[PDB]
Design a protein around this ligand. Structure first.
Ligand SMILES: O=C(O)[C@@](O)(COP(=O)(O)O)[C@H](O)[C@H](O)COP(=O)(O)O
Ligand SMILES: O=C(O)[C@@](O)(COP(=O)(O)O)[C@H](O)[C@H](O)COP(=O)(O)O
Ligand SMILES: O=C(O)[C@@](O)(COP(=O)(O)O)[C@H](O)[C@H](O)COP(=O)(O)O
Ligand SMILES: [Mg+2]
Ligand SMILES: [Mg+2]
Ligand SMILES: [Mg+2]
Ligand SMILES: [Mg+2]
Lengths: 464, 123, 464, 119, 123, 118, 227
């Protein structure tokens, strides 16, 4: 019988006896139902409207095999410390997703369910991406190993720097700042995320002048240099036009704001970079609009996994100690998800599912934002060698200029690497290690003096 | 359980799924268009009463959208009787045509009203 | 003197004496500072880090004229009913933005400020887009007037329907459902937002079968029909490939999930649709992840203005009475922002700034989600003639099938239009109007019987 | 010929009245795409001046109203109708929409009258 | 205010909007052609009396422009009676065809005259 | 020189171009226009068509009728310069569309001193 | 109401009480009417025929809102010491123009009005281009700042030179003249305006030889050169 009418979602979408398949996409939702809505019905509604069902019974369900396609809420767990909040686990069959499309994956899982009247708030905490689906993506154009091999850089974190002021500089002054920064010991400099093409500085003029500066610094130091040229644009055509010129200039790396630009355009650029040998730096502009609050949105670890699939060689991961929010344990959690091939479930770090990557290249985490020389020991200890540490104001804010500012950061970093390698405890001896270096490095001494009392300590919103 | 008919079920857009308009209901629709200060106009067609595609197939292109204008749009008309009168005049000269009443909004330049007022024999 | 060191943001970015220019982009931020952070400093931080400044003083500011480029917090207002919450108004010079790029506009305004440790929460409520900037965008490929003229439809809201189940149907069964739905009186049918290309149904097979069904229904009824073919894909290339085939088939309309696909890809499609005569339906999948909560995120009216600039002929606006959240006054507010050429400031509807569009075409609002025949009077009263009302489950959930389900909705709609035109009050006489029609329409009577007791009434999260 | 000489201080005014273009130079140009003979032969029109008409108002009409005006003009006996010189592509009417509706209009008029039409 | 008819209003180019040509009016048109030293020729068509598009739709292409030639162009003709004589002959053999008279200017190789001289019953 | 032609010009068979007469003309000008330009020309009537009291179709009919009436008269040997007005008036007797147009623009003329003189 | 017939242009297009919008394109015309034509009518005719109107009334005006589209003469002032000459100010709504097209802008403003019989003469003196319209254009490919930065030239006017004779020189002699000019201190040399491609010197040959010459001059002097 096709029985017209409305039925509870849990009658079809709540299956606590379900045993997940290794090909299913699993999701962990933090659900806050409206008063009077049972968690089983709330979890079932989420599973239903993000897979195959709607608000009333439709006869067409009988034309197919819904048991084979439906999303299922198979487990519910109360959240300790919160009121009327539960973690609902949902399983999605592999067949529901388009191969190689992060865009399609999110359209189903976070498409319409966050606006349901029956819910007060909803947050997607984690996703278990099956290896069968992982293999349908290209992943990073290059990855950690290949990047280090192309740039010939090993044994220490990489060093970067964002040019400032954010906006307002001319193309020639941009290259001027880039040259001075790179010749001082930094490996990279970069366009600020909002620097695309504007009246005060058009993109082609910028690309041209930055390449001149970049090549001059490389010749001067003898170390390979790069400047992330921003390809972020208003259309696919414009984005490609910029990437193409970078290819013509023979430079090593370009960047893209993957969330403001979009997954569709990002995947296009990722494939182009793979086919043309360009490293791709990814900026996460806008992410905090989505992942800051504990009760609603999507946690960054989910946005991070999505980027590793779509494609990017670098991605910002936070600093923990900088001007932007980021808890230590949670950060270490998604940093492993970005670099390793296998990460086991660990609730203390917000990792709800064991994730395997079947050799998809790792992504270099980038620590940036309000950090300076005194943070060097802590950054090195937290992230390890495979990371990129960026100092924008921390370089251009040095009293002697860009080159001396770059030297101070390079010296501070190597001093920490040497001390660590010798067996010293960076966490306990951090400050003394920096002080020891100021004795022979006037550039570092000048920097330490300026930012000695600067720290960023506030209560975090995003907590496990 | 009723099966919706497939034969001779042609429709005419807005209002065509309701029962045929009586003389008073028709007058009320005209009053509605006049009270909104829209400009009334009559259109008629004898050959192609429904859209088709003969000269082109690209997106958004269809033949049969344009019908013939009866005289001119009645600018300044404030009396519904004047509109109903032209309808009768048009019907007398073209008893074999489909007749449509439309109303123009000159500020947005969009027809805010459009409905068949007369259909020939067999429809 | 270039004085190295950290200074408060308010020293440079809080200018309460500033008089805005007609070329400035104005933003209204709902700011919730951390305890101990003055609202002037919090507002200044937002203005600074979203325009030209960083956390410490940089010498390069002296190479340019910062007074001419800096974002400025020019007004602060306490929010009544909340604690330690303020509305901070920020002005951004026209020069800071790339012409025709919504991607660039958001990268600056919502790029990094939402993650600042110094803030507990941040929400962007509104944006005043100056006419000088509006003219750099193409806007909708066609707009309300042109769409009605191309389809030859006037004097009533348009009618649509999403095919169900969401996923799981084969290409042939999809066309089968489409034909039956359209022949019953609906103007459009559509791919569900997550229906792109999958194992159970590949896109080209779907496009092909839907065109056959679409053309059969048009021939049968004599009214122009359309089916939104989803062009949403994983890359720009795939998206274009699908749009191209739709063009070859000669069909009138395609659709795109602009947020999951991304602004860059959406703008590309918008331009293509303009050059090839295709109407473009926009689905807002994922929007609730961003705009549901009052304390953090971006209000939908901002996402709505962004779409009108990038380009789209339709966009979902909510139903107010359906299964998804949406307050009446707030909804009417952004519906005017989508259709009209001029909307004056009105705080009772959440409109913070007067917005002018200098003839940029209007966008048709689409009401969809958990609505049925009894909601018809209210929908017609709220949205008026220029709207698209969609009934997915409300059509395929009818006891007699798709055609009778379509008839019931078409009849219900025209009955309301006729009653309204005759001078009857839809708000007061709504129910009686529907009952009167059930006397001569067995299709409508069957529908009314099934959903008679179904309503969606829950407390709203998003309130002015 | 008229590049810089009209601005010479030594002159009060200057006007180019005529030009004798030698046949050897004339042969280096394509000239009219078709010309009088070929045009009359393509349109099958002979024995009288051709008739045209510029749609009005110059600016301000929508694409659909433009095609409406065109069909009514052509069906009455005019051979051609035309966009006003300043009608290119504007907010009130984009070019592709105008082209499309004018095509529907002119083909309707041609079928009705039996005489070849153009816009 | 009169509305221009839409039904059975086919036209035949030059002179077709004027009242039907009388016997003498027709003769004067032939005199005009002959006085200008253009050479007369008659063409007739039985099935496709109006242009259409069956074989191609590119710019400038139309089917139905060419009609069938009646004998040959009357080179060296100086007597209008001779032309009106062939017209009657053509009508006798093809009473069901449209017949038009054209005048050739061999110097410009352009038809300077062309008008329908006979139409089958019903037109 | 009486027509401002300073040099003899040859075109070695380059196709000719159709001159187009347009701008503030109406039915009463038809005889003069036909007389000045001849068959190889295009006469355009914008306001002269959309300004007809009965609309576009009747406006077009008025112009097509006026034109064919002048062509017929000319071919019969009548002087368009001397009999122009009479020829138009004769046609108004059987063409109500033309009659209505003639009534509207009968007094309209554009006569001003010319700047560009020989 | 549609009433056929001719009316004076001033009844619709002369609006002395109109206050201009910041989005309007403003034009200042130097108008010389024929004897007997009032300046108000002359000004109104220019505004009308360069925007929405024609010589007689048309019913189609009622299909749109002419008030938001019509161009309008909003001010008239006499010209000192000149007989029967005035400066007429006309405002054009932003909606009348195609974005980024100077071709379209001139087609309206100076398309047909200069030939009106009712005028003895007409001259467009100035144009106020609104910022909303300015933003629809790319503008200079580079501009002053960028040019100086690319060429590395600051603190003085740049120096150029047109090669002579205007026409008649071969491609090699052209390059010969160019090298000699540039090596002496000039920043640029240039093709005369009428030097395109001719029997005495084809363009590709010229481009080729001039490149050789300018690179030689640049290497010799150490200053960036161009032709
Ligand atoms: O715009 C800025 O603020 C930065 O250039 C850093 O400048 P400073 O080096 O001067 O602080 C970076 O984009 C942020 O680090 C991005 O945040 P995250 O890394 O969290 O994505
Ligand atoms: O997936 C769905 O649920 C729908 O197809 C509606 O189905 P029903 O017609 O069966 O409810 C629509 O996409 C939502 O209306 C989108 O939400 P909104 O309009 O708020 O963007
Ligand atoms: O804009 C106009 O005025 C017209 O459309 C005529 O309108 P009317 O038919 O309503 O007068 C024509 O472009 C002019 O004839 C051009 O002048 P010319 O032919 O001298 O170049
Ligand atoms: Mg940045
Ligand atoms: Mg949907
Ligand atoms: Mg014109
Ligand atoms: Mg020169």
């Amino acid at each position: 019988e096709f029985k017209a009418g409305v039925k509870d979602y849990k009658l079809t979408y709540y299956t606590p006896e379900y045993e997940t398949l290794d090909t299913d996409i699993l999701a962990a939702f933090r659900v806050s139902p409206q008063p009077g809505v049972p968690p089983e019905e709330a979890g079932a509604a989420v599973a239903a409207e993000s897979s195959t069902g709607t608000w009333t019974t439709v006869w067409t369900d009988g034309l197919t095999n819904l048991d084979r396609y439906k999303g299922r809420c198979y487990h519910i767990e109360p959240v300790a410390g919160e009121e009327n909040q539960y973690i609902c686990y949902v399983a999605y069959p592999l067949d529901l997703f388009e191969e190689g499309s992060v865009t399609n994956m999110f359209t189903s899982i976070v498409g319409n369910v966050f606006g349901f009247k029956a819910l007060r708030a909803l947050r997607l905490e984690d996703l278990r991406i099956p290896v069968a689906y992982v293999k349908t993506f290209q992943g990073p154009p290059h990855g950690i190993q290949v990047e280090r091999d192309k740039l010939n850089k090993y044994g220490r974190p990489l060093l970067g720097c964002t040019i400032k002021p954010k906006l307002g500089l001319s193309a020639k002054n941009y290259g001027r700042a880039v040259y001075e920064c790179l010749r001082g010991g930094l490996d990279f400099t970069k366009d600020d995320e909002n620097v695309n093409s504007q009246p005060f500085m058009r993109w082609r003029d910028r690309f041209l002048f930055c390449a001149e500066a970049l090549y001059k610094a490389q010749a001067e130091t003898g170390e390979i240099k790069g400047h992330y040229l921003n390809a972020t644009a208003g259309t696919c055509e414009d984005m490609m036009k910029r990437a193409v010129f970078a290819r013509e200039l023979g430079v090593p790396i370009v960047m893209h704001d993957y969330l403001t630009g979009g997954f569709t355009a990002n995947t296009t650029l990722s494939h182009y970079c793979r086919d043309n040998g360009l490293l791709l730096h990814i900026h996460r502009a806008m992410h905090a609009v989505i992942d800051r609050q504990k009760n609603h949105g999507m946690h960054f670890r989910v946005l991070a996994k999505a980027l590793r699939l779509s494609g990017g060689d670098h991605i910002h991961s936070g600093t923990v100690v900088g001007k932007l929010e980021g808890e230590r344990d949670i950060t270490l959690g998604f940093v492993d998800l970005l670099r390793d091939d296998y990460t086991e479930k660990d609730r203390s770090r917000g990792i709800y599912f064991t994730q395997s990557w079947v050799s998809t290249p790792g992504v270099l985490p980038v620590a940036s934002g309000g950090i300076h020389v005194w943070h060097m020991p802590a950054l090195t200890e937290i992230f390890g060698d495979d990371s990129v540490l960026q100092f924008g104001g921390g370089t251009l804010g040095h009293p002697w200029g860009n080159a001396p500012g770059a030297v101070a950061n390079r010296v501070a970093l190597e001093a920490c690497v040497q001390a660590r390698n010798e067996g010293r405890d960076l966490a306990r001896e951090g400050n003394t290690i920096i002080r020891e270096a100021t004795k022979w490095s006037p550039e570092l001494a000048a920097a330490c003096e300026v930012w000695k009392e600067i720290k960023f300590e506030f209560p975090a919103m995003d907590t496990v | 359980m009723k099966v919706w008919p497939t034969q001779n079920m042609k429709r005419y857009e807005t209002l065509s799924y309701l029962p045929p308009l009586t003389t008073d209901q028709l007058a009320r629709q005209v009053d509605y268009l006049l009270n909104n200060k829209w400009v009334p106009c009559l259109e008629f067609e004898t050959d192609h009463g429904f859209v088709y595609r003969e000269h082109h197939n690209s997106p958004g292109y269809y033949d049969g959208r344009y019908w013939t204008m009866w005289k001119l749009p009645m600018f300044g008309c404030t009396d519904p009787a004047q509109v109903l009168n032209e309808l009768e005049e048009c019907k007398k000269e073209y008893p074999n045509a489909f007749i449509r009443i439309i109303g123009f909004d000159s500020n947005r330049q969009v027809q805010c009203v459009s409905f068949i007022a007369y259909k020939p024999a067999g429809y």
